[PDB]
PDB file of C-alpha atoms in Angstrom:
ATOM      1  CA  UNK A   1     -23.779 -18.475  -1.678  1.00 22.33           C
ATOM      2  CA  UNK A   2     -22.352 -15.172  -2.916  1.00 22.19           C
ATOM      3  CA  UNK A   3     -23.352 -11.972  -1.149  1.00 22.06           C
ATOM      4  CA  UNK A   4     -24.716  -9.091  -3.166  1.00 21.56           C
ATOM      5  CA  UNK A   5     -22.216  -6.228  -2.829  1.00 18.61           C
ATOM      6  CA  UNK A   6     -22.716  -2.597  -1.829  1.00 19.18           C
ATOM      7  CA  UNK A   7     -20.012  -0.454  -3.480  1.00 19.51           C
ATOM      8  CA  UNK A   8     -19.069   3.175  -2.789  1.00 17.30           C
ATOM      9  CA  UNK A   9     -17.669   5.349  -5.605  1.00 18.51           C
ATOM     10  CA  UNK A  10     -15.247   8.144  -4.682  1.00 20.11           C
ATOM     11  CA  UNK A  11     -14.681  10.793  -7.352  1.00 19.20           C
ATOM     12  CA  UNK A  12     -11.188  12.166  -6.815  1.00 21.20           C
ATOM     13  CA  UNK A  13      -9.392  15.228  -8.145  1.00 20.90           C
ATOM     14  CA  UNK A  14      -5.824  16.415  -7.420  1.00 20.32           C
ATOM     15  CA  UNK A  15      -5.467  14.192  -4.326  1.00 24.21           C
ATOM     16  CA  UNK A  16      -8.775  15.124  -2.694  1.00 22.67           C
ATOM     17  CA  UNK A  17     -12.258  13.641  -2.865  1.00 24.99           C
ATOM     18  CA  UNK A  18     -14.805  15.865  -4.590  1.00 23.30           C
ATOM     19  CA  UNK A  19     -18.451  16.185  -3.537  1.00 24.85           C
ATOM     20  CA  UNK A  27     -15.221  21.774  -3.357  1.00 24.43           C
ATOM     21  CA  UNK A  28     -13.366  19.357  -1.073  1.00 29.93           C
ATOM     22  CA  UNK A  29     -14.824  16.191   0.457  1.00 31.90           C
ATOM     23  CA  UNK A  30     -12.054  14.896   2.698  1.00 32.34           C
ATOM     24  CA  UNK A  31      -9.018  12.815   1.892  1.00 33.80           C
ATOM     25  CA  UNK A  32      -9.869   9.839  -0.357  1.00 36.53           C
ATOM     26  CA  UNK A  33      -7.879   7.406   1.799  1.00 34.72           C
ATOM     27  CA  UNK A  34      -9.496   8.465   5.039  1.00 33.77           C
ATOM     28  CA  UNK A  35     -12.953   8.584   3.453  1.00 34.19           C
ATOM     29  CA  UNK A  36     -12.290   5.080   2.100  1.00 36.33           C
ATOM     30  CA  UNK A  37     -11.111   3.873   5.513  1.00 37.70           C
ATOM     31  CA  UNK A  38     -14.410   5.204   6.854  1.00 42.25           C
ATOM     32  CA  UNK A  39     -16.479   3.335   4.273  1.00 44.60           C
ATOM     33  CA  UNK A  40     -14.485   0.150   5.081  1.00 48.08           C
ATOM     34  CA  UNK A  41     -15.567   0.272   8.705  1.00 47.59           C
ATOM     35  CA  UNK A  42     -19.282   1.020   8.359  1.00 47.09           C
ATOM     36  CA  UNK A  43     -20.031  -1.903   6.012  1.00 46.10           C
ATOM     37  CA  UNK A  44     -19.116  -0.911   2.423  1.00 46.55           C
ATOM     38  CA  UNK A  45     -17.999  -3.986   0.433  1.00 46.81           C
ATOM     39  CA  UNK A  46     -15.673  -2.499  -2.236  1.00 50.61           C
ATOM     40  CA  UNK A  47     -14.434   0.947  -3.235  1.00 53.49           C
ATOM     41  CA  UNK A  48     -14.300   2.448  -6.721  1.00 55.60           C
ATOM     42  CA  UNK A  49     -12.020   5.475  -7.147  1.00 53.15           C
ATOM     43  CA  UNK A  50     -12.562   7.595 -10.299  1.00 53.71           C
ATOM     44  CA  UNK A  51      -9.860  10.162 -11.095  1.00 53.92           C
ATOM     45  CA  UNK A  52     -10.384  13.326 -13.130  1.00 55.01           C
ATOM     46  CA  UNK A  53      -7.060  15.063 -12.375  1.00 58.64           C
ATOM     47  CA  UNK A  54      -5.306  16.850 -15.262  1.00 57.33           C
ATOM     48  CA  UNK A  55      -3.154  14.639 -17.471  1.00 55.21           C
ATOM     49  CA  UNK A  56       0.146  16.258 -16.494  1.00 53.12           C
ATOM     50  CA  UNK A  57       0.178  15.131 -12.848  1.00 54.06           C
ATOM     51  CA  UNK A  58      -2.443  12.377 -13.291  1.00 54.49           C
ATOM     52  CA  UNK A  59      -0.186   9.339 -13.802  1.00 56.47           C
ATOM     53  CA  UNK A  60       1.806  10.073 -10.649  1.00 55.11           C
ATOM     54  CA  UNK A  61      -1.248  11.190  -8.678  1.00 55.10           C
ATOM     55  CA  UNK A  62      -3.402   8.112  -9.274  1.00 60.95           C
ATOM     56  CA  UNK A  63      -0.410   5.870  -8.579  1.00 58.10           C
ATOM     57  CA  UNK A  64       0.155   7.567  -5.200  1.00 60.19           C
ATOM     58  CA  UNK A  65      -3.540   7.148  -4.438  1.00 61.48           C
ATOM     59  CA  UNK A  66      -3.480   3.441  -5.277  1.00 63.70           C
ATOM     60  CA  UNK A  67      -0.402   2.812  -3.171  1.00 66.82           C
ATOM     61  CA  UNK A  68      -1.907   4.632  -0.179  1.00 65.92           C
ATOM     62  CA  UNK A  69      -5.244   2.823  -0.449  1.00 68.00           C
ATOM     63  CA  UNK A  70      -3.568  -0.561  -0.879  1.00 70.10           C
ATOM     64  CA  UNK A  71      -1.334  -0.287   2.192  1.00 70.31           C
ATOM     65  CA  UNK A  72      -3.728   1.564   4.530  1.00 70.56           C
ATOM     66  CA  UNK A  73      -7.080  -0.037   3.694  1.00 66.60           C
ATOM     67  CA  UNK A  74      -7.680  -3.768   3.301  1.00 66.45           C
ATOM     68  CA  UNK A  75     -10.794  -3.665   1.120  1.00 68.34           C
ATOM     69  CA  UNK A  76     -11.131  -4.734  -2.552  1.00 66.77           C
ATOM     70  CA  UNK A  77     -10.944  -1.671  -4.732  1.00 67.79           C
ATOM     71  CA  UNK A  78     -10.998  -0.554  -8.360  1.00 63.52           C
ATOM     72  CA  UNK A  79      -9.403   2.535  -9.872  1.00 63.30           C
ATOM     73  CA  UNK A  80     -10.312   4.242 -13.115  1.00 67.59           C
ATOM     74  CA  UNK A  81     -10.916   7.476 -14.960  1.00 66.74           C
ATOM     75  CA  UNK A  82      -9.062   8.044 -18.214  1.00 70.86           C
ATOM     76  CA  UNK A  83      -7.161   4.769 -18.340  1.00 66.28           C
ATOM     77  CA  UNK A  84      -6.244   4.586 -22.020  1.00 65.37           C
ATOM     78  CA  UNK A  85      -3.523   1.976 -22.455  1.00 68.86           C
ATOM     79  CA  UNK A  86      -2.149  -1.250 -21.048  1.00 71.27           C
ATOM     80  CA  UNK A  87       0.915   0.428 -19.512  1.00 68.90           C
ATOM     81  CA  UNK A  88      -1.241   2.720 -17.374  1.00 72.36           C
ATOM     82  CA  UNK A  89      -3.463  -0.123 -16.226  1.00 72.88           C
ATOM     83  CA  UNK A  90      -0.365  -2.221 -15.540  1.00 71.09           C
ATOM     84  CA  UNK A  91       1.252   0.445 -13.342  1.00 72.21           C
ATOM     85  CA  UNK A  92      -1.952   0.843 -11.315  1.00 75.85           C
ATOM     86  CA  UNK A  93      -2.441  -2.899 -10.755  1.00 75.27           C
ATOM     87  CA  UNK A  94       1.179  -3.490  -9.787  1.00 73.19           C
ATOM     88  CA  UNK A  95       1.045  -0.447  -7.486  1.00 76.50           C
ATOM     89  CA  UNK A  96      -1.751  -2.230  -5.617  1.00 79.45           C
ATOM     90  CA  UNK A  97      -5.118  -1.754  -7.292  1.00 80.01           C
ATOM     91  CA  UNK A  98      -7.148  -4.983  -7.339  1.00 79.91           C
ATOM     92  CA  UNK A  99      -8.941  -3.933 -10.546  1.00 80.51           C
ATOM     93  CA  UNK A 100      -8.947  -1.175 -13.129  1.00 81.25           C
ATOM     94  CA  UNK A 101     -11.951   0.280 -14.900  1.00 81.43           C
ATOM     95  CA  UNK A 102     -11.798   1.049 -18.617  1.00 83.25           C
ATOM     96  CA  UNK A 103     -14.506   2.531 -20.783  1.00 83.25           C
ATOM     97  CA  UNK A 104     -13.935   4.701 -23.869  1.00 83.06           C
ATOM     98  CA  UNK A 105     -10.522   3.135 -24.486  1.00 79.36           C
ATOM     99  CA  UNK A 106     -12.169  -0.290 -24.151  1.00 76.30           C
ATOM    100  CA  UNK A 107     -14.749   0.535 -26.822  1.00 73.50           C
ATOM    101  CA  UNK A 108     -12.170   2.056 -29.190  1.00 75.38           C
ATOM    102  CA  UNK A 109      -9.532  -0.670 -28.630  1.00 78.76           C
ATOM    103  CA  UNK A 110     -11.183  -3.900 -27.421  1.00 79.64           C
ATOM    104  CA  UNK A 111      -7.843  -5.741 -27.408  1.00 79.01           C
ATOM    105  CA  UNK A 112      -7.024  -3.622 -24.350  1.00 79.90           C
ATOM    106  CA  UNK A 113      -9.422  -5.758 -22.279  1.00 78.51           C
ATOM    107  CA  UNK A 114      -7.563  -8.889 -23.380  1.00 75.99           C
ATOM    108  CA  UNK A 115      -4.058  -7.580 -22.751  1.00 77.48           C
ATOM    109  CA  UNK A 116      -5.001  -6.692 -19.161  1.00 79.68           C
ATOM    110  CA  UNK A 117      -6.863  -9.957 -18.594  1.00 78.08           C
ATOM    111  CA  UNK A 118      -4.028 -12.100 -19.971  1.00 75.13           C
ATOM    112  CA  UNK A 119      -1.459 -10.388 -17.775  1.00 73.86           C
ATOM    113  CA  UNK A 120      -3.323  -9.917 -14.485  1.00 78.23           C
ATOM    114  CA  UNK A 121      -6.374 -12.196 -14.853  1.00 78.42           C
ATOM    115  CA  UNK A 122      -9.867 -11.293 -15.919  1.00 78.70           C
ATOM    116  CA  UNK A 123     -10.725 -10.443 -12.325  1.00 78.80           C
ATOM    117  CA  UNK A 124      -8.514  -7.367 -12.708  1.00 78.88           C
ATOM    118  CA  UNK A 125     -10.565  -5.900 -15.598  1.00 77.74           C
ATOM    119  CA  UNK A 126     -13.807  -3.943 -15.170  1.00 80.69           C
ATOM    120  CA  UNK A 127     -15.413  -2.591 -18.334  1.00 81.05           C
ATOM    121  CA  UNK A 128     -17.596   0.422 -17.541  1.00 80.63           C
ATOM    122  CA  UNK A 129     -20.415   0.553 -20.088  1.00 81.47           C
ATOM    123  CA  UNK A 130     -22.442   3.768 -20.355  1.00 81.37           C
ATOM    124  CA  UNK A 131     -25.699   3.111 -22.176  1.00 80.37           C
ATOM    125  CA  UNK A 132     -28.683   5.208 -23.253  1.00 80.12           C
ATOM    126  CA  UNK A 133     -31.957   4.332 -24.960  1.00 75.99           C
ATOM    127  CA  UNK A 134     -32.043   6.069 -28.366  1.00 71.65           C
ATOM    128  CA  UNK A 135     -35.058   5.361 -30.594  1.00 71.51           C
ATOM    129  CA  UNK A 136     -36.010   2.296 -28.554  1.00 74.18           C
ATOM    130  CA  UNK A 137     -32.668   0.494 -28.710  1.00 77.29           C
ATOM    131  CA  UNK A 138     -29.953   0.337 -26.067  1.00 78.37           C
ATOM    132  CA  UNK A 139     -26.807   2.051 -27.341  1.00 74.05           C
ATOM    133  CA  UNK A 140     -23.292   2.380 -25.944  1.00 73.59           C
ATOM    134  CA  UNK A 141     -21.875   5.875 -25.396  1.00 71.43           C
ATOM    135  CA  UNK A 142     -18.234   6.980 -25.081  1.00 70.37           C
ATOM    136  CA  UNK A 143     -16.682  10.259 -23.876  1.00 74.43           C
ATOM    137  CA  UNK A 144     -18.453  10.397 -20.490  1.00 75.32           C
ATOM    138  CA  UNK A 145     -21.814   9.521 -21.991  1.00 77.52           C
ATOM    139  CA  UNK A 146     -21.624  12.232 -24.657  1.00 76.33           C
ATOM    140  CA  UNK A 147     -21.004  10.218 -27.854  1.00 75.36           C
ATOM    141  CA  UNK A 148     -23.415   7.724 -29.323  1.00 78.06           C
ATOM    142  CA  UNK A 149     -21.104   5.086 -30.824  1.00 75.61           C
ATOM    143  CA  UNK A 150     -23.728   3.318 -32.902  1.00 75.94           C
ATOM    144  CA  UNK A 151     -22.844   0.056 -31.087  1.00 75.47           C
ATOM    145  CA  UNK A 152     -25.801  -1.841 -29.636  1.00 77.25           C
ATOM    146  CA  UNK A 153     -25.613  -2.523 -25.900  1.00 76.99           C
ATOM    147  CA  UNK A 154     -26.519  -6.120 -26.784  1.00 74.09           C
ATOM    148  CA  UNK A 155     -23.460  -6.583 -28.974  1.00 76.44           C
ATOM    149  CA  UNK A 156     -20.961  -4.820 -26.710  1.00 76.85           C
ATOM    150  CA  UNK A 157     -21.611  -6.800 -23.505  1.00 75.41           C
ATOM    151  CA  UNK A 158     -21.100 -10.046 -25.434  1.00 75.03           C
ATOM    152  CA  UNK A 159     -17.906  -8.741 -27.021  1.00 77.77           C
ATOM    153  CA  UNK A 160     -16.781  -7.523 -23.588  1.00 75.16           C
ATOM    154  CA  UNK A 161     -17.144 -11.007 -22.121  1.00 75.05           C
ATOM    155  CA  UNK A 162     -15.577 -12.507 -25.249  1.00 75.29           C
ATOM    156  CA  UNK A 163     -12.567 -10.226 -24.777  1.00 70.81           C
ATOM    157  CA  UNK A 164     -11.900 -11.455 -21.222  1.00 73.95           C
ATOM    158  CA  UNK A 165     -13.443  -8.765 -18.989  1.00 69.28           C
ATOM    159  CA  UNK A 166     -14.054  -9.764 -15.373  1.00 71.41           C
ATOM    160  CA  UNK A 167     -16.925  -7.414 -14.533  1.00 71.26           C
ATOM    161  CA  UNK A 168     -19.331  -4.938 -16.144  1.00 70.82           C
ATOM    162  CA  UNK A 169     -20.015  -1.593 -14.491  1.00 68.58           C
ATOM    163  CA  UNK A 170     -23.359  -0.726 -16.115  1.00 69.40           C
ATOM    164  CA  UNK A 171     -24.393   2.939 -15.900  1.00 70.41           C
ATOM    165  CA  UNK A 172     -27.674   4.078 -17.421  1.00 67.07           C
ATOM    166  CA  UNK A 173     -27.025   7.615 -18.680  1.00 67.61           C
ATOM    167  CA  UNK A 174     -30.583   8.763 -18.010  1.00 74.57           C
ATOM    168  CA  UNK A 175     -30.375   7.911 -14.278  1.00 75.41           C
ATOM    169  CA  UNK A 176     -26.777   8.914 -13.542  1.00 72.96           C
ATOM    170  CA  UNK A 177     -26.710  12.048 -11.401  1.00 73.05           C
ATOM    171  CA  UNK A 178     -30.371  11.789 -10.482  1.00 73.40           C
ATOM    172  CA  UNK A 179     -31.509  10.236  -7.221  1.00 74.80           C
ATOM    173  CA  UNK A 180     -34.421   8.771  -9.164  1.00 76.36           C
ATOM    174  CA  UNK A 181     -33.627   4.998  -9.042  1.00 75.57           C
ATOM    175  CA  UNK A 182     -31.728   2.208 -10.826  1.00 76.17           C
ATOM    176  CA  UNK A 183     -32.594   1.440 -14.440  1.00 77.89           C
ATOM    177  CA  UNK A 184     -33.885  -2.048 -13.779  1.00 80.34           C
ATOM    178  CA  UNK A 185     -35.121  -2.398 -17.356  1.00 84.05           C
ATOM    179  CA  UNK A 186     -31.553  -2.180 -18.652  1.00 84.27           C
ATOM    180  CA  UNK A 187     -30.223  -4.613 -16.012  1.00 81.84           C
ATOM    181  CA  UNK A 188     -32.920  -7.119 -16.950  1.00 81.92           C
ATOM    182  CA  UNK A 189     -31.976  -6.543 -20.572  1.00 82.97           C
ATOM    183  CA  UNK A 190     -28.280  -7.199 -19.943  1.00 83.21           C
ATOM    184  CA  UNK A 191     -28.557  -9.924 -17.265  1.00 87.02           C
ATOM    185  CA  UNK A 192     -29.303 -12.816 -19.686  1.00 85.05           C
ATOM    186  CA  UNK A 193     -26.678 -11.695 -22.258  1.00 85.75           C
ATOM    187  CA  UNK A 194     -23.572 -12.235 -20.092  1.00 87.51           C
ATOM    188  CA  UNK A 195     -22.247 -14.451 -17.292  1.00 87.92           C
ATOM    189  CA  UNK A 196     -20.139 -11.604 -15.882  1.00 88.33           C
ATOM    190  CA  UNK A 197     -20.922  -9.843 -12.598  1.00 89.91           C
ATOM    191  CA  UNK A 198     -22.934  -6.642 -13.113  1.00 90.33           C
ATOM    192  CA  UNK A 199     -22.489  -3.480 -11.040  1.00 91.16           C
ATOM    193  CA  UNK A 200     -25.644  -1.359 -11.269  1.00 88.03           C
ATOM    194  CA  UNK A 201     -24.631   2.293 -11.422  1.00 84.06           C
ATOM    195  CA  UNK A 202     -26.565   5.518 -11.749  1.00 82.98           C
ATOM    196  CA  UNK A 203     -29.829   6.510 -10.097  1.00 85.67           C
ATOM    197  CA  UNK A 204     -29.445   5.429  -6.450  1.00 87.49           C
ATOM    198  CA  UNK A 205     -31.994   7.355  -4.392  1.00 87.51           C
ATOM    199  CA  UNK A 206     -33.489   5.157  -1.659  1.00 88.30           C
ATOM    200  CA  UNK A 207     -32.790   1.810   0.033  1.00 90.61           C
ATOM    201  CA  UNK A 208     -35.585   0.161  -1.934  1.00 93.71           C
ATOM    202  CA  UNK A 209     -33.649   1.062  -5.105  1.00 91.86           C
ATOM    203  CA  UNK A 210     -30.894  -1.391  -4.174  1.00 89.06           C
ATOM    204  CA  UNK A 211     -33.479  -4.119  -3.664  1.00 88.81           C
ATOM    205  CA  UNK A 212     -34.954  -3.392  -7.107  1.00 87.99           C
ATOM    206  CA  UNK A 213     -31.530  -3.652  -8.728  1.00 87.63           C
ATOM    207  CA  UNK A 214     -30.677  -6.989  -7.107  1.00 87.08           C
ATOM    208  CA  UNK A 215     -34.063  -8.445  -8.051  1.00 85.44           C
ATOM    209  CA  UNK A 216     -33.398  -7.413 -11.680  1.00 87.28           C
ATOM    210  CA  UNK A 217     -30.182  -9.474 -11.582  1.00 87.47           C
ATOM    211  CA  UNK A 218     -27.469  -7.010 -10.552  1.00 85.01           C
ATOM    212  CA  UNK A 219     -24.611  -8.530  -8.546  1.00 84.41           C
ATOM    213  CA  UNK A 220     -23.465  -5.281  -6.965  1.00 83.20           C
ATOM    214  CA  UNK A 221     -24.872  -1.802  -6.508  1.00 85.30           C
ATOM    215  CA  UNK A 222     -22.742   1.315  -6.739  1.00 85.83           C
ATOM    216  CA  UNK A 223     -23.545   4.760  -5.329  1.00 86.61           C
ATOM    217  CA  UNK A 224     -21.687   7.843  -4.125  1.00 85.92           C
ATOM    218  CA  UNK A 225     -23.590  10.909  -2.904  1.00 86.07           C
ATOM    219  CA  UNK A 226     -26.276   9.050  -0.966  1.00 83.09           C
ATOM    220  CA  UNK A 227     -23.401   7.590   1.076  1.00 82.12           C
ATOM    221  CA  UNK A 228     -21.098  10.600   1.223  1.00 81.24           C
ATOM    222  CA  UNK A 229     -23.977  12.838   2.358  1.00 83.35           C
ATOM    223  CA  UNK A 230     -24.525  10.496   5.343  1.00 82.50           C
ATOM    224  CA  UNK A 231     -27.796  10.286   3.413  1.00 79.48           C
ATOM    225  CA  UNK A 232     -28.204   6.483   3.423  1.00 80.49           C
ATOM    226  CA  UNK A 233     -26.858   4.346   6.242  1.00 80.97           C
ATOM    227  CA  UNK A 234     -25.060   1.270   4.960  1.00 81.04           C
ATOM    228  CA  UNK A 235     -25.943  -0.801   8.040  1.00 81.86           C
ATOM    229  CA  UNK A 236     -29.634   0.026   7.713  1.00 81.18           C
ATOM    230  CA  UNK A 237     -29.529  -0.650   3.973  1.00 85.32           C
ATOM    231  CA  UNK A 238     -27.960  -4.061   4.603  1.00 86.62           C
ATOM    232  CA  UNK A 239     -30.414  -4.958   7.368  1.00 85.91           C
ATOM    233  CA  UNK A 240     -33.267  -3.807   5.148  1.00 84.81           C
ATOM    234  CA  UNK A 241     -31.775  -5.787   2.269  1.00 88.10           C
ATOM    235  CA  UNK A 242     -31.510  -8.894   4.471  1.00 85.46           C
ATOM    236  CA  UNK A 243     -35.094  -8.660   5.758  1.00 88.25           C
ATOM    237  CA  UNK A 244     -36.250  -8.604   2.141  1.00 89.56           C
ATOM    238  CA  UNK A 245     -34.488 -11.903   1.435  1.00 91.09           C
ATOM    239  CA  UNK A 246     -31.251 -10.676  -0.170  1.00 87.86           C
ATOM    240  CA  UNK A 247     -27.901 -12.130   0.863  1.00 84.36           C
ATOM    241  CA  UNK A 248     -25.661  -9.368   2.192  1.00 84.34           C
ATOM    242  CA  UNK A 249     -22.450  -9.308   4.214  1.00 84.74           C
ATOM    243  CA  UNK A 250     -23.384  -8.167   7.707  1.00 84.68           C
ATOM    244  CA  UNK A 251     -20.941  -6.161   9.769  1.00 85.27           C
TER     245      UNK A 251
END
């Protein structure tokens, strides 16, 4: 039976992890590899002029110095960019705003590299009692219902949904288990719960709601949650996790 996954997200900028520096992304990823993290997500926010080259150098370094599944994203807007990153060594790319505005992009990536190579990050917010998709880093209400987008996302060939609840992202307040439960029955795809991770019990709550993986950043980078303890705690509470 599949293990539930614990994923670490590294926000990167100009070649360095960002918390003001936060170490080298590669060596911080190596570290996560060794203490029990299951996959890495790297999100780039570098300026467009050096971004293409910078992310590509990151991917190459991560692919030949770590041996962990990883995803790269942040401002991937077209098939050619996604293609360069996958062929440079990324296992998956994340797309978001460009996915919403050009859904064929999902299909082009999936048909070339397989659906496993495509993650669609969906940012959603509850507006007037209905789940809505937002673009532009959670700042634009698209008018598209969360219910319709996840189905279209699977229809288009995505391999995985990275589901962030805009209300919880950046708080340490907890995962938005209501939204997971809302999405879980609408799609067969794996769901990464993102946004809100405060305490070990939060991960349990997300997996009980139907998440397949759980993503966090600060709580791990602040040596603020111990992955080993989280996994042991997860196991004790009856959740399949990959130990050591």
